[PDB]
Short mmCIF file of C-alpha atoms and ligand atoms in Angstrom, two decimals:
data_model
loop_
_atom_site.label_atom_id
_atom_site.label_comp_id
_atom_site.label_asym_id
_atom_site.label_seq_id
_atom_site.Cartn_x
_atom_site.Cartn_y
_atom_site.Cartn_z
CA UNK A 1 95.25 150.65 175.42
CA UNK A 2 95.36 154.18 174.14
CA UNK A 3 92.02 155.61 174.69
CA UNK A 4 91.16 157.80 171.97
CA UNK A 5 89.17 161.37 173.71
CA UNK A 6 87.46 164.32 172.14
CA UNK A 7 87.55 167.98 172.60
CA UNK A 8 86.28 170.95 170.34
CA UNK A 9 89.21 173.04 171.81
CA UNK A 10 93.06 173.17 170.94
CA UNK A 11 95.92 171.07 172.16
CA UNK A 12 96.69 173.93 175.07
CA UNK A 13 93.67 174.55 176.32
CA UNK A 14 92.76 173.74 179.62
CA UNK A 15 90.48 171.00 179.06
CA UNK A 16 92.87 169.07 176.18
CA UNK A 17 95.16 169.79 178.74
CA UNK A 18 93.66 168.28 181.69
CA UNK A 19 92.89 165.15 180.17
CA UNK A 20 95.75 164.72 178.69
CA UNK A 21 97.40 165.16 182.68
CA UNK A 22 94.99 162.59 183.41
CA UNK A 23 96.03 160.43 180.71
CA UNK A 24 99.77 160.50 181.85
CA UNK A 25 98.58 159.87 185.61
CA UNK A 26 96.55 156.64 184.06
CA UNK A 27 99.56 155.17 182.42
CA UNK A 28 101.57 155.04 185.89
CA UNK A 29 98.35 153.60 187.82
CA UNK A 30 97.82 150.98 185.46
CA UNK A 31 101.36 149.66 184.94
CA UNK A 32 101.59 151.08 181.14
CA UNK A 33 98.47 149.80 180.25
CA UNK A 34 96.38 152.60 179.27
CA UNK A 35 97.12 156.03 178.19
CA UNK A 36 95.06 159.05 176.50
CA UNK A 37 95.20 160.73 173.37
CA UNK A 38 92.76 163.52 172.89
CA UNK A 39 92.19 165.00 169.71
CA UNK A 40 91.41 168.46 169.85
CA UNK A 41 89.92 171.20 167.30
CA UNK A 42 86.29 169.25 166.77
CA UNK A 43 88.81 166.80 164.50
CA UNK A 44 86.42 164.40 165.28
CA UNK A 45 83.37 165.76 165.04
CA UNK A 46 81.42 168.26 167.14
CA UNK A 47 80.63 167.92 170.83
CA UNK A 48 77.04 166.01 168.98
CA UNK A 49 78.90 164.18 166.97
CA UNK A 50 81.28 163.21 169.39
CA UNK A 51 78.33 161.86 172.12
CA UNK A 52 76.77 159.60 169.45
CA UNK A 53 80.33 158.00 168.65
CA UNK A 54 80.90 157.96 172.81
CA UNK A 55 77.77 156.03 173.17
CA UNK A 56 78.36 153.23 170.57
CA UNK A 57 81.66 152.83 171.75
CA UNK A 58 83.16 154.06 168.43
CA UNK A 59 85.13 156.47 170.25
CA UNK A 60 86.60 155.93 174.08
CA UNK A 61 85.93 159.53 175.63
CA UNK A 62 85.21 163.42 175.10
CA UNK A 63 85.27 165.50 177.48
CA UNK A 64 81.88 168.36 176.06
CA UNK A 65 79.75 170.91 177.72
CA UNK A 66 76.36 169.93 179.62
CA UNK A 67 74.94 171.25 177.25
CA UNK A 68 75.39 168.84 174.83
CA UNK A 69 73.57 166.19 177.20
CA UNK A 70 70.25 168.23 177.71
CA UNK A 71 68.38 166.33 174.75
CA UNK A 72 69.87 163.11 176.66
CA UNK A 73 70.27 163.10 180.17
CA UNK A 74 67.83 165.02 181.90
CA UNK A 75 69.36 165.73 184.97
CA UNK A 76 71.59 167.39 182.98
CA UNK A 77 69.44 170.33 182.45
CA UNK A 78 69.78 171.26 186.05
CA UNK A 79 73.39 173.14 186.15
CA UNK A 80 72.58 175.00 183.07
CA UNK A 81 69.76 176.39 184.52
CA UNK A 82 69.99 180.10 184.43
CA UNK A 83 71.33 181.48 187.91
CA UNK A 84 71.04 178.66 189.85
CA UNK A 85 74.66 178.94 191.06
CA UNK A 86 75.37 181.93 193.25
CA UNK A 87 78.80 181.87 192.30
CA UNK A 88 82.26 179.53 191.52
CA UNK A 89 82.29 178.91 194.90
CA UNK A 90 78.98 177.88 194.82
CA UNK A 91 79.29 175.69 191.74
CA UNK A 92 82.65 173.75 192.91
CA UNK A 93 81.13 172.92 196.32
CA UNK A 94 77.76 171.55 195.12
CA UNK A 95 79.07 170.66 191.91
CA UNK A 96 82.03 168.11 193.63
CA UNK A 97 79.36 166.97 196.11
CA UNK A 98 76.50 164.62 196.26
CA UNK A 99 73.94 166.58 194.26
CA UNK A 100 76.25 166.79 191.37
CA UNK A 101 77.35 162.62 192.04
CA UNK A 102 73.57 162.31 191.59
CA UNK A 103 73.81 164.21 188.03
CA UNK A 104 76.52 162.24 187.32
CA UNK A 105 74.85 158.85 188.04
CA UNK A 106 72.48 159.65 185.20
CA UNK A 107 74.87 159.21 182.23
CA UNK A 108 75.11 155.02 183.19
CA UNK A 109 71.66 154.64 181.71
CA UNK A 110 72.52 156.34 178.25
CA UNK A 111 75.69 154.51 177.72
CA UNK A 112 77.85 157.00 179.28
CA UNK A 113 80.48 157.30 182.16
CA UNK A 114 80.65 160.61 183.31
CA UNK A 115 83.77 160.35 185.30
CA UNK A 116 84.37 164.25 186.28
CA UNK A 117 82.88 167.74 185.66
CA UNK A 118 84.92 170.73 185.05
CA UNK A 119 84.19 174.46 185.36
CA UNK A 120 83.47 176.29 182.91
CA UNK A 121 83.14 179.59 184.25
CA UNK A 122 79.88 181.88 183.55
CA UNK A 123 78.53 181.88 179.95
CA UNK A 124 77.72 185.77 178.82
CA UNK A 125 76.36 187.27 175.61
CA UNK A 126 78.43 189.08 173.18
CA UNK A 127 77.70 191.04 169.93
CA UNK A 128 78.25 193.90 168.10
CA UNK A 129 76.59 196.09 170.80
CA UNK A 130 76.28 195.74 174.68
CA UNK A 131 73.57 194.49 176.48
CA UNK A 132 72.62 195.70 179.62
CA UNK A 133 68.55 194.24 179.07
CA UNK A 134 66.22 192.24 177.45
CA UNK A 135 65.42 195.18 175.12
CA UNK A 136 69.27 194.91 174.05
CA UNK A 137 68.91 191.85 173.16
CA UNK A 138 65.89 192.16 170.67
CA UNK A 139 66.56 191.51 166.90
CA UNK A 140 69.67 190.30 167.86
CA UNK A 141 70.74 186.41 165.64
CA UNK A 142 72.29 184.70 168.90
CA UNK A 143 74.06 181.35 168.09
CA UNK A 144 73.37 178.75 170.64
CA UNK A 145 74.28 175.41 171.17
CA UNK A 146 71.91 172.61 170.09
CA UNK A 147 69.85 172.61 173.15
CA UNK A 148 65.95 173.08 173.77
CA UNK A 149 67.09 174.99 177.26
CA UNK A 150 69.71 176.99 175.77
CA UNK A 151 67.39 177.83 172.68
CA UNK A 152 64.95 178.82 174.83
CA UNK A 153 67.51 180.87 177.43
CA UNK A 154 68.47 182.96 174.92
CA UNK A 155 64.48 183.63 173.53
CA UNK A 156 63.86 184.37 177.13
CA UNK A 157 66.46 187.06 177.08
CA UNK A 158 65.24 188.72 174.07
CA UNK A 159 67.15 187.30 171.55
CA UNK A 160 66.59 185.22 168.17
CA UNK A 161 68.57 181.82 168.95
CA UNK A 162 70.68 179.75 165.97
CA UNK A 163 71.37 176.50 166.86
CA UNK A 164 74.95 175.70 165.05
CA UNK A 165 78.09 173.96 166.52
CA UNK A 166 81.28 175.50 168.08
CA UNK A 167 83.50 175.07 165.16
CA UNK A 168 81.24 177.58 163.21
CA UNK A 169 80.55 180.50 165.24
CA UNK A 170 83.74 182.79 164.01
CA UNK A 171 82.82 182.11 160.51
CA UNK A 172 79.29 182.68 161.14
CA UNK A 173 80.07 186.11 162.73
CA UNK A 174 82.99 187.19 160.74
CA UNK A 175 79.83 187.39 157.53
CA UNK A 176 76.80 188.17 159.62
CA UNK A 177 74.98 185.02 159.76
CA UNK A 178 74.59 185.55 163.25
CA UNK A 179 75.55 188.62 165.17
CA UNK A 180 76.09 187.21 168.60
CA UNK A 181 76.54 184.21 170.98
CA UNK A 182 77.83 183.54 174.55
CA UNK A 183 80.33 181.97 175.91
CA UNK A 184 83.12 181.83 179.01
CA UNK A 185 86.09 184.92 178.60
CA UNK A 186 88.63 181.52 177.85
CA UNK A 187 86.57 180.26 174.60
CA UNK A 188 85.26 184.01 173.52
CA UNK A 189 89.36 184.57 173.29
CA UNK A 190 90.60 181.29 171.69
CA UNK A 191 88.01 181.32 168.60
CA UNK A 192 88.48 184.84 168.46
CA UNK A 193 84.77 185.89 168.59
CA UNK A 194 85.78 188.67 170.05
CA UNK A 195 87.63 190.27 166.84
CA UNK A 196 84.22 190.07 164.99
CA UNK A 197 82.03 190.40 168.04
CA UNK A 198 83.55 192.86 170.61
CA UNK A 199 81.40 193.72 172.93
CA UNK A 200 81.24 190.86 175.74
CA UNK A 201 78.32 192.05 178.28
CA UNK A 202 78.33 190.36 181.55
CA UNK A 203 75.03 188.84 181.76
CA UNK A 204 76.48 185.46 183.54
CA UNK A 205 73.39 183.77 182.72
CA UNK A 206 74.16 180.11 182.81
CA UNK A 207 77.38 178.12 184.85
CA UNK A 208 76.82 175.37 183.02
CA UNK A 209 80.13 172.51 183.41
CA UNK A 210 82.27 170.57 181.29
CA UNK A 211 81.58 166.90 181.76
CA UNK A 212 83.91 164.19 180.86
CA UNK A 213 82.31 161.13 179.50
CA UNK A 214 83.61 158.03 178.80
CA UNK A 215 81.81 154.74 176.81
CA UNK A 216 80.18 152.28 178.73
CA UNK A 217 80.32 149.78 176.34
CA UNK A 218 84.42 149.99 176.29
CA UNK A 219 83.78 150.39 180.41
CA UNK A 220 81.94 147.45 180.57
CA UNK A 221 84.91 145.30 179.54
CA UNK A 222 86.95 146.47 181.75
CA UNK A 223 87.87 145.01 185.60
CA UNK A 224 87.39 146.85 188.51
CA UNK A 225 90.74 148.00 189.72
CA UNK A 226 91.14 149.55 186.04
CA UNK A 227 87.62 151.11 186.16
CA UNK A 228 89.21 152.65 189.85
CA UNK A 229 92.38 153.90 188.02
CA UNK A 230 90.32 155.83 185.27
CA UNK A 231 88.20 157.45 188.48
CA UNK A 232 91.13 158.08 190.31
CA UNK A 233 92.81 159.94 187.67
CA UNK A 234 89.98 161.97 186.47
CA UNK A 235 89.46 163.23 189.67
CA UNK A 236 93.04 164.06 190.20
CA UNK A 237 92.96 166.27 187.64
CA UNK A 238 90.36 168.63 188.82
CA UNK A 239 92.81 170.32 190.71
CA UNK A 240 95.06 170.71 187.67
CA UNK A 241 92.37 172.13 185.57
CA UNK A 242 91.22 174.41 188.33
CA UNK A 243 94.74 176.37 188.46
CA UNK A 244 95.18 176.37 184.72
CA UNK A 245 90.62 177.64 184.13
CA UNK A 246 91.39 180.07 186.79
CA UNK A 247 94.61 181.69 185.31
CA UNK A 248 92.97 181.64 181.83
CA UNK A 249 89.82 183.45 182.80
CA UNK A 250 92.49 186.03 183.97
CA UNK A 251 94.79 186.16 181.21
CA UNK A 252 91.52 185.97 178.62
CA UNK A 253 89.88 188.87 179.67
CA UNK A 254 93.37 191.04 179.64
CA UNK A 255 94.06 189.38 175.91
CA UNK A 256 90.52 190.49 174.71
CA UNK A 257 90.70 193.69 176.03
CA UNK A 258 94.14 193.95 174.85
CA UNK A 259 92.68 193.03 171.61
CA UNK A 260 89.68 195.84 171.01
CA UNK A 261 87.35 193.82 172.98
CA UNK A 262 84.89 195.96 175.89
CA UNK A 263 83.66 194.02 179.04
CA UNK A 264 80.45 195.29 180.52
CA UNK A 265 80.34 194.33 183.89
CA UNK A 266 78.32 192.54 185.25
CA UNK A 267 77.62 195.22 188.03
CA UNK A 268 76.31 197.59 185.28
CA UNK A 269 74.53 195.08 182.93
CA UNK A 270 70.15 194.74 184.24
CA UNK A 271 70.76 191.55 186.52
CA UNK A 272 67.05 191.79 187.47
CA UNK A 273 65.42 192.14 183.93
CA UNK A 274 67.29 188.75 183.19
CA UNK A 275 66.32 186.71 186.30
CA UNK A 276 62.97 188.17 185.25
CA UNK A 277 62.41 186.82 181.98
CA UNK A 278 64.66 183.43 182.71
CA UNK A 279 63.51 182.07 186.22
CA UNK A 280 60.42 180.01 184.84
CA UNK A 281 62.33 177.56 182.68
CA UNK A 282 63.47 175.65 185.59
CA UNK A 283 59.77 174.82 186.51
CA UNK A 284 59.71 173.87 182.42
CA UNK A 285 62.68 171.75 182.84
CA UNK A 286 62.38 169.92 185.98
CA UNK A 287 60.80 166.53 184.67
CA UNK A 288 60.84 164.33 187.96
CA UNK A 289 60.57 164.77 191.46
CA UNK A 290 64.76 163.44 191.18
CA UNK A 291 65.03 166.59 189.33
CA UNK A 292 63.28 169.05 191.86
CA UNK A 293 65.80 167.12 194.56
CA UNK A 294 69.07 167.69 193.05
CA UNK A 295 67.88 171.63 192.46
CA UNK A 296 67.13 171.50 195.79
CA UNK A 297 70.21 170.07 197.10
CA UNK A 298 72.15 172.24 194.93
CA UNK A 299 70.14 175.50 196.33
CA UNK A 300 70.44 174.07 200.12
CA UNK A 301 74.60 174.14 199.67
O1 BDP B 1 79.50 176.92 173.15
C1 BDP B 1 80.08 175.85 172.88
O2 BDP B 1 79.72 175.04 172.02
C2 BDP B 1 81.33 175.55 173.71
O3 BDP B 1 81.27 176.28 174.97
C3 BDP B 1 82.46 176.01 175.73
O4 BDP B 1 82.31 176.82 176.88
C4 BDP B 1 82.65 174.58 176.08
O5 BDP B 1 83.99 174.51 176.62
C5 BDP B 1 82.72 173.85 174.81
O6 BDP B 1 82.83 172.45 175.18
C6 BDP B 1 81.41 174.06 174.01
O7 BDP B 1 81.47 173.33 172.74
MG1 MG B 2 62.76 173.43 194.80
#
């Protein structure tokens, strides 16, 4: 059938565009009889939204940030903990290994398949000032995404956190209902945040992925060579998304800065006031002892 996926990004953005690779590569495995259309621009909801309709099988994928699970799936708190990953390299490898299998497994018992993560690069603050510390950061209306960690991330850093979904940010900084949020250098270009909010500071606080869910109620029904061909496909297009995430972060940050925008780097913005102030939510967070194991497996890679 035509299985019917959501993303809050546009038709050529890397995600839309990796599962709609993957989509192409499931029609061949499965003789013509599955495909993908995903339907970008939060057209069917937001990422919220989107999970609920995921889970009672009323849609057949979306492919959303972690972030969006942290109310959900507990283990996936752990890779938007802030500065657990060292760096990409850091992410990919423990990420696409067992610890992040093990965050994966999770989703099965809240009516999810979570077939693949993708990067997502390093969320940073931006505003209408830089931020090099905490005191930057004070008095400052940061939207966040609708997470307890992420609310309290941004509290942590010094900020006043909004909860409101993706679709809304530009509007709600083009009139001052919030002054700031944070975000990869890809998304900070393609909602153009950065016209109304030009000053992206480098804090690279959280590395949190893109996960790609898909309904277990629809997966249940489903045999197991056709449940292998969705797998197999999903994970054949990390390597797609990787070179098209990794040429966007490029061309993003040349298009802001093209476009007014100033980059503090992240060599110049207070690292150690941040780690500071964020390092004890992951002892808040960690829930179970299978949640203190995957951190540490994560760490250990
Ligand atoms: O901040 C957000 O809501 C967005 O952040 C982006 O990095 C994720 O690609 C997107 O899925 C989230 O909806
Ligand atoms: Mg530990």
């Amino acid at each position: 059938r035509v299985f019917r996926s959501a993303d809050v990004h546009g038709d050529s953005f890397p995600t839309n565009m990796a599962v709609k690779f993957m989509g192409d590569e499931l029609s061949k495995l499965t003789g013509g009889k599955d495909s993908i259309k995903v339907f970008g621009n939060s057209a069917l909801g937001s990422e919220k939204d989107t999970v609920d309709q995921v889970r009672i099988g009323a849609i057949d994928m979306a492919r959303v940030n972690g972030a969006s699970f942290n109310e959900i799936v507990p283990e996936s708190l752990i890779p938007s903990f802030p500065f657990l990953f060292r760096d990409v390299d850091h992410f990919r490898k423990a990420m696409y290994g067992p610890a992040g299998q093990k965050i994966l497994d999770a989703f099965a018992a809240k009516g999810m398949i979570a077939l693949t993560f993708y990067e997502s690069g390093a969320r940073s603050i931006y505003a209408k000032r830089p931020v090099r510390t905490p005191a930057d950061m004070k008095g400052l209306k940061v939207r966040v995404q609708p997470s307890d960690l992420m609310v309290d991330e941004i509290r942590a850093m010094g900020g006043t956190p909004t909860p409101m979904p993706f679709a809304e940010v530009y509007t709600g900084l083009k009139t001052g209902l919030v002054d700031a949020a944070e975000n990869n250098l890809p998304s900070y270009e393609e909602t153009k945040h950065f016209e109304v909010a030009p000053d992206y500071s480098e804090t690279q606080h959280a590395m949190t992925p893109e996960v790609l869910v898909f309904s277990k109620k629809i997966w249940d029904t489903l045999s197991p060579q056709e449940q292998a061909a969705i797998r197999k496909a999903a994970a054949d297009s990390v390597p797609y998304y990787q070179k098209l995430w990794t040429a966007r972060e490029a061309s993003a940050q040349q298009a802001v800065t093209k476009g007014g925008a100033n980059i503090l780097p992240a060599a110049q913005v207070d690292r150690a006031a941040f780690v500071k102030a964020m390092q004890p939510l992951w002892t808040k967070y960690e829930k179970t002892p299978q949640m203190k194991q995957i951190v540490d497996e994560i760490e250990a890679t």
